[model samples]
Target chain A: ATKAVAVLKGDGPVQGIINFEQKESNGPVKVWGSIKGLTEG
Target chain B: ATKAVAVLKGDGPVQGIINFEQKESNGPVKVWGSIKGLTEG
Candidate 1:
């Protein structure tokens, strides 16, 4: 059987920050980010 | 052409650490983590 899936495409540059949390009194422990190529439809 | 693609699925649990960096004297400016539901085929 063949299936079709949709992919997420970013426009221009993607920028965001992810924060890790835990029980009260918790903050970001580790974090990293990246920038990828973008395409036009 | 009907392009077919595959998606990534987490097994049991998915865990990882991401770090963000910059130019000189760069380090993880932001940190975060996530847990997603797993699917079985």
Candidate 2:
């Protein structure tokens, strides 16, 4: 099982979620999320 | 003065800042930020 965080839309049309996953006993927190409608740079 | 939060670059290269501002004594928190390289939907 993995732990995840919910990303609440903050005054914008963008919404997504962040998942923190790891493999083995000790590993880096694998971070990934899906975000939408952000100003391009 | 407005209280802004530093959006540290996570696992991805999407780096930006989120500024929370409000006007007058009774006002809503105006939230805005600049995010780069986000998957569009």
Pick by TM-score: which candidate is best?
A: 1
Residue B20 lDDT, candidate 1, scale 0-100: 23
How far is A7's C-alpha from truth in model 2 (Å)? 19
TM-score of each: 0.21, 0.20
Worst 10 residues of 2 chain A by lDDT: A14-23
What is the CA-based DockQ of model 2?
0.04
For model 2 the TM-score comes to 0.20
Worst 10 residues of 1 chain A by lDDT: A14-23
**What are the lDDT figures for the candidates, one per model?**
0.32, 0.31
Residue pairs with backbone overlap in model 2: none
How many Å off is the CA of B36 in candidate 1? Answer: 27
DockQ of each: 0.07, 0.04
Distance from true location, Cα of B32 in model 1, Å? 9.8
Model 1 / residue B16 / CA error / Å: 14
- Model 1 ranges with Cα > 4 A deviation: A1-20, A25-28, B1-41
lDDT of 1 by residue, B1-41 (tens): 33344233322222242122222342333434443332343
lDDT of 2 by residue, A1-41 (tens): 22233343333343221231222333222223345444322
